[PDB]
Amino acid sequence: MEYTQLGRIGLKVSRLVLGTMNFGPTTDEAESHAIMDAALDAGINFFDTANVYGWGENKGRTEEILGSWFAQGGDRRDKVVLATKVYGNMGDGPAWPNHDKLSALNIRRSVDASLKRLGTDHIDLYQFHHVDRDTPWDEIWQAMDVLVRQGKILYVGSSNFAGWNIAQANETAARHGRLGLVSEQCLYNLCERRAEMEVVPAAREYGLGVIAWSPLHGGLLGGIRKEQREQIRYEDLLDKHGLEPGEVALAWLLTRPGVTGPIVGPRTADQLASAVRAAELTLTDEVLTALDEIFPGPGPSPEAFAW
Amino acid sequence: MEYTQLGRIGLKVSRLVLGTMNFGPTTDEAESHAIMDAALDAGINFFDTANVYGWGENKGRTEEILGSWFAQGGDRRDKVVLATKVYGNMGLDGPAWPNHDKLSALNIRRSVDASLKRLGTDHIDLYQFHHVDRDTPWDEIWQAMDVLVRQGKILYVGSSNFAGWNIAQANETAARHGRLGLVSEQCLYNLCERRAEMEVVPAAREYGLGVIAWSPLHGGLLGGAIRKEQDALPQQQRYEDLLDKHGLEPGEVALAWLLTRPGVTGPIVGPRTADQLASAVRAAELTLTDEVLTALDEIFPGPGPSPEAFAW
Amino acid sequence: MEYTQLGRIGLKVSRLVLGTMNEAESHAIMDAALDAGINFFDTANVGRTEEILGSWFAQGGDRRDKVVLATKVAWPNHDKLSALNIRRSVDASLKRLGTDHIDLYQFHHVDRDTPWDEIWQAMDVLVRQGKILYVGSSNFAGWNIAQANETAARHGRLGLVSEQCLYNLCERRAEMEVVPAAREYGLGVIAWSPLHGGLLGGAIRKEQLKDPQQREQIQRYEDLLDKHGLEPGEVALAWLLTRPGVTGPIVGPRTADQLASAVRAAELTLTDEVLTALDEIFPGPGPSPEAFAW
Amino acid sequence: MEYTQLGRIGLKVSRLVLGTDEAESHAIMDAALDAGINFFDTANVRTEEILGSWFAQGGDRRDKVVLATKVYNAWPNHDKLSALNIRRSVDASLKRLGTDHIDLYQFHHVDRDTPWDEIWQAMDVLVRQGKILYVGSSNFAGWNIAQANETAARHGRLGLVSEQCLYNLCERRAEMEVVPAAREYGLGVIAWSPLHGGLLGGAIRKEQEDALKDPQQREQIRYEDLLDKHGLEPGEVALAWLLTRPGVTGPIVGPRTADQLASAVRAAELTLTDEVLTALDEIFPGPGPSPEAFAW
Amino acid sequence: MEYTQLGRIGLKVSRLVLGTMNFGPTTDEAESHAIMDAALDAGINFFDTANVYGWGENKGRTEEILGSWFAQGGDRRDKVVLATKVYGNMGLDGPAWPNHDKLSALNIRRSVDASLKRLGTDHIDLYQFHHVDRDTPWDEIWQAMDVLVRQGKILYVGSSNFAGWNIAQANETAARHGRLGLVSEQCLYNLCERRAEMEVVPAAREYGLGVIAWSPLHGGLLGGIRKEKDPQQREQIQRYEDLLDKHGLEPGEVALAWLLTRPGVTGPIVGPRTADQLASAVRAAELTLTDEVLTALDEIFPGPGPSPEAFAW
Amino acid sequence: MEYTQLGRIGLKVSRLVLGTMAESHAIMDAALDAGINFFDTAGRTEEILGSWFQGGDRRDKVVLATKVYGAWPNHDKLSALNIRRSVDASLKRLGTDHIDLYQFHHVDRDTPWDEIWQAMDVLVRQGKILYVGSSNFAGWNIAQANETAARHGRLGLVSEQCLYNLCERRAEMEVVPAAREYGLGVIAWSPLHGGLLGGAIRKEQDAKDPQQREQIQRYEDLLDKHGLEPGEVALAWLLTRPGVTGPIVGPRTADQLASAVRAAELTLTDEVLTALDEIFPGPGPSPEAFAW
Ligand SMILES: NC(=O)C1=CN([C@@H]2O[C@H](COP(=O)(O)OP(=O)(O)OC[C@H]3O[C@@H](n4cnc5c(N)ncnc54)[C@H](OP(=O)(O)O)[C@@H]3O)[C@@H](O)[C@H]2O)C=CC1
């Protein structure tokens, strides 16, 4: 298992990040637990969840499933970097005022509900699930600082931010000796590469980790075999090279400059073992060039659209 | 029900603010609760109170009534943006024992603790200065407020009855050291009294505060007083006849007016009864047309911003 | 001659400010101002006034050295407070004035479209080139003063040292917020049109602008001063000199007599009953929020 | 002639930006002045020396324009944004322009190798000498605008006041990040190449006498037909559209004839209908802001 | 009873400060309690104590006595501004164990915890440094105090026995990081000893500190010979006793009342053993000294005024 | 010649400062050759130094100290206005393009430190001035001034000139402790107390008072008892005090200079110091001086 620093900070994390979205909705509590135990045995120390995970009326169930996993003892809590999220409505449909988004009010009520479901007295990485254009950064950093100084959270990360939101966030934190965002969780994969224009550049300038969510573009790059689509040629290129598609999509992300790693979302213990193999592939220079021609990326702005 | 950001901050509030000063001294506990439950159903999430509401010997009774409202559960506390105030003397009226009114750190500490206990909650969402205290410096005030912010006992700080230059001094002092400044100003603003337009509202708009107008009916005067001779206040009627003309109620139009004023978050509506609430609710969605505004403006001329309002 | 510090700063100025009048007769007035001990000269008028001061300094004899010189700042950017307009205005002013520095350089009016970091950029360029010493405002709201000086203090800069506001017996609404702000932040207050355009100069007696009930209060005014043997021109000035935070009024004498009167107004002590009576005739609003709430 | 504040600052400019032999340009600058255009830019659609001699004719020409120039695409330190190149480039520009100050001094392109404390040192030397009033950018990413202006504010310096970016009906990707950042930070947005090098100024009709070679490209350039159906000229509608976009100060126009000037002036006066806007949007789709543009 | 702001801050205090040094070592618990209820009845809201008050093996007795006073309910705690001190050795007199005196963050933590426990309250209003400690840097002291401010354990910080430049340095250092600095200096100031006027009081006034005068009677030396050292100093006590007999003034009341005329002075510490001494202090507050008396007092007891003039020009 | 860092800064100065009163030029050149580099004007004095700056690297070898020179409003005191006019007049009179140590003549309680530092920073940034010092300040004025400078990255006061000698030791209460905390050099002005400590009684052969004659006599006798000249001992006493850079001295001949030089080289005995301390006791620091 390969380890890296999470951007500029002192935290070391596995280059595979255990996504937990499926835990509860598509995978039951006991199988969720055994996937997590198997991640630990594979050296994966970095678990991503969110409050809203679970579905509809069962929002929070994923957090509860991790909660009962930690409750089994065995140094499970001590061993994981636990990451969750705040922004979402925990109620489905339109929200009551201040029960979503990033007001100090919603942050205060969200983190308490999360800590209670997770059965733990602290979150290691608390992440904004999305940018909230209506909350100013002095309000956001005030709320996060309350939680940091109480020992309730350690680090703060973003998800689905623009590059300039990362800049504004971290410049604002630094001005008053706050540690700013330590990571951005962004949609990045072979099919969708527009994060290269500004998000990954800003994150690397500011020393954020980059965690790629939906690394398989929600299954689309993990093998039609179970059946614009010309591209998904990829499959044929891999049949030719004897490479499994889910593995290549993951390993490809591990080659991208500044990417901490993908968030893997395995339903099964076997889907996990597949991801673990993906961290050990070494895609050849030939395969890289082909994959580039099938799935071109814009590269950084302003060149992506100008010169 | 219309919502807006409270000035520049992430907080979303109803453009009607439930005033509560009648809960206790005129309206009783069980009915106060009925009004508040009615406001929630109307989508009103923003409740204003103070420590001093209850009057005379029953100062703090209103805070206690909201306390028992929350104690009934049903997500009442969780759904409400709870605002109260500090500054007022909480002992029997007349001259205060020193540091038992105004805005020393000493009084802020004793007041918030007494309020939280009466309100039966662990935090106030918006804690407001009830008035400016010229004798307390902002480094002292922000120290006190920041202790409360970092313990999780308050989220936001707001002002009431400030001068525009007090708002600037407050927020520039907060910003210099990281702190979120004032997020709202509660000022006296209606058709009769528009001098908050000279400086208080421009300062608030510059600094990104929400503006909450208290006494939106100038103490009844604009809620059909002439037609209820069937405080005292000469040349202080054409208003009523213009509304009788146009087929509008006096109390509804006074509120609908403040809602068109630039930078105004909304009025503090202070119903004694349930139908007076629903009357406020109708005012929220009322639409004053270009013509009646011009008329109302002609009857109640405003000064507009300083220095123009007295100079050029 | 009565002196005060200009607000919080170390500059000492006469409590009479010599404004602009209407070439050889201006020079005579300015020399007589000097000999009366007036050292604070302003070009206050909401091009040639600067030139007249400049020809005054060319005579030598320590006229520039003895004087605190104060001045102020349509085709786009030829008005208002952009850094661009500020540079072109000061350059012209320095050429018209025939001096290499302005002592107090004032904004004419609040410009709600220029941010304070742009304004202080432009002012700091001039300060550090030695072309200006201090900065003041005119026709600001109270909160503009607070904003301006809070922004200045953040980066070590001396902020506004003076506000020039319309302030006289008839118009007292500067007392609501402008003067309190100015006192909080230690700005000198310079009262413009102290006589209210002549209206308090005893202009019923000169009849041998405004006349509904403004007339009645001006009559009750002249009458009171008749009954006390005090000149109307003198009293309106001396009243401002009793107001907390006021440095002094801008006076523009064109004759030796008008100067001599202003000088007498500075040495005039008004009794408590005069003041109580002027206050009855000419009520002030007091400070916000008390002026209009509690 | 419509004026706007440049971004958040107190400078007012014409919403047309006058970009770029000696006698011909000297004459059309004088007519731009007379049409109310005060914003003169040395970006193209020796240039500085032409402007130089124009001022040299007296007549309050310098006093009436906002002058905008750029740092000069190789010997080390003769390109890019080191303090060294800034010093040699501004000095050369002031001599050429025959003036003692530039109103807007712009960067030509983000330089990833120069840190912002070095750039602002250099700009600040020039600000404090009176040599420059404001600083602007060209071809930045959104986050470069954020980092620059957050670095300037930290030490009391005014930051970037403007960004000049490629923006027109055909290239709307400045709308993802560059334009939202500019708006957050109060930069005026100056649209460079507003007619896409010619393509949006009746290019198909002008064939009856770039790459129209690709079939999907020319099918969009439907635009000409829509404008015929409403009786509007393309060279004008391309400019007027940009003037409706949030945050845009104005486009850079390079008129040479009286007719190009008169037509530019008309485009600044043209109010387009919601129907045409909606119609132009269907043809020329915008990406929306990030992260919505590609995530949610 | 006359009130004033404590320097520049919003706190309003009586111009008489109740000293408690006698509560425990001479006055017993029960009579102390009666003097404190009597002080409250006179409108005196400002109570000064110290950890070391009690002397010898009984250090801390005074704080315990105020603690038992608060425990009697009746809004006693809620009505006073409670001030105590840190710096002093709380063990056996004679050289302290290292870090058991002075102003280390270590000694500040243990002293405050012990004071709060003895005082039987969760917070002190004014926590004062009993003396300057030149060995502790201000970034350490303000860290220590800010910890207590943010826990709600103290509100305000004050000094005692500082030099003027210590006041400036402390507050400049606090202001640098948004901390309220010292709100008050408790300095030795009275008729025989006016050298605080040189720099201490000018510095306090510039920085907006309250000035509280301790030893207001120079240890009884200005409270009346008539109950009976250096011949040139007994000389000036006689001229002072002689002058107040002539005007029918009690020397105890004038020494206090004189301090209330000095610019920048909040008020004196009055330290009663008995109820009659307290009533006497209250009458000292109501007294209006005449210009003749002030000018004669000044004639007897000259001050230096401020530096640099006091020694140069 | 003994040299020292001036307070905390990198400038090295002689522990003798050359105060002021064609003959002048000669004693200045003599002082140079004696190794004295620190020249202090403490008008006209300035005009004379300017004519000296004849060439021969004269300006280049000296640390040139002057004063603000402090009536018509704003022709005294420390407003930005008066600072600008005094410095310009001083640079013209001194015939040089920069002053090394520009000093305030007194504390001005009416000018705030943000105004003062604006004026000095202007001058610093134009290269007209390198360092700023004070004269006749209180300790807290030093503290306030230097805290205000440092908040904005400005070098603060680097020296205080205070009245300091055996007779008048009250600078030790607070002025000298503040100076030492903030790393200012202390320049002792009037080191002989107007002439009283330079053998005044034997010159008899300002103060009739028998209490201070008493004191001078015990000093003069003690100096005969150990065969030491008072004009030298009064200088040498100050050079032993903590934080003292050195005294100002104004020798007019080859022979007075050479007595100054010897005072700077003379070690005083611990016995003579204990004896000088008994005759001329010091107040000690505040608050101990008057509290505990
Ligand atoms: N911040 C945000 O906005 C969001 C963040 N996330 C985070 O990122 C994580 C990943 O998102 P998700 O969409 O699940 O990611 P993927 O794109 O990896 O989708 C996972 C799915 O792909 C298939 N799959 C998983 N592992 C393998 C494998 N090793 N080989 C082949 N196929 C495989 C399975 O689909 P099948 O059903 O066919 O078996 C599985 O359910 C989440 O768990 C969450 O923590 C995700 C979405 C939103």
Author numbering:
A (entry chain H): 1 to 91, 93 to 224, 226 to 229, 251 to 255, 257 to 331
B (entry chain B): 1 to 230, 244 to 246, 249 to 251, 256 to 331
C (entry chain E): 1 to 22, 29 to 52, 60 to 86, 96 to 230, 246 to 331
D (entry chain A): 1 to 20, 28 to 52, 61 to 87, 89, 96 to 231, 244 to 255, 257 to 331
E (entry chain F): 1 to 224, 226 to 229, 247 to 331
F (entry chain C): 1 to 21, 30 to 50, 60 to 70, 72 to 88, 96 to 230, 244 to 245, 247 to 331
Paper's wording?
Aldo-keto reductases (AKRs) are a superfamily of oxidoreductases capable of reducing carbonyl to primary and secondary alcohols, found in all phyla. In this work, we identify the enzyme AKRtyl, which is responsible for tylosin reduction. Phylogenetic analysis indicates that AKRtyl is the founding member of subfamily D within family 12 in the AKR superfamily. Specifically, by combining steady-state and transient kinetics, X-ray crystallography and molecular dynamics simulation, we demonstrate that AKRtyl exhibits a positive synergy mediated by an unusual Monod-Wyman-Changeux (MWC) paradigm of allosteric regulation at low concentrations of the cofactor NADPH, but an inhibitory effect at high concentrations is observed.
The other set of purified state structure contains two complete octamers (16 subunits) in each asymmetric unit with two and four NADP(H)s all bound to the same tetrameric side, respectively. Unlike the first purified state structure, the two tetramers in each octamer of this structure exhibit different but regular features. All subunits of cofactor-bound tetramers behave similarly to the first purified state structure in which the functional loops are clear and ordered. However, cofactor-free tetramers exhibit a higher degree disordered conformation in every subunit, including loops for NADP(H)-binding (residues 21–28, 230–241), the loop for substrate binding (residues 87–95) and the loop where the catalytic residue Tyr53 is located in (residues 50–59). Moreover, the side chain of the catalytic residue His130, faces the opposite direction of the active center, and the side chain of Trp214 twists. We further confirmed these structural features is not resulted from crystal packing. This disordered conformation exhibits unsuitability in multiple functional structural modules such as cofactor binding, substrate binding, and catalysis. Noteworthy, the disordered conformation actually represents an ensemble of various non-functional conformations in which the disordered loops in the crystal structure oscillate randomly, so we consider this conformation to be dormant, and the subunits of cofactor-bound tetramers belong to the active conformation with ordered and suitable structural features, and the multiple conformations of AKRtyl suggest conformational plasticity. To summarize, the eight subunits in the first purified state structure all belong to the active conformations, while the second structure contains half active and half dormant conformations which coincidentally camped based on conformational states to form tetramers. Upon further analysis, in both structures, we found that the dormant tetramers have no NADP(H) bound but the active tetramers bound at least one NADP(H). This regular characteristic suggests that the binding of NADPH induces the transformation of the conformation of the entire tetramer to be active.
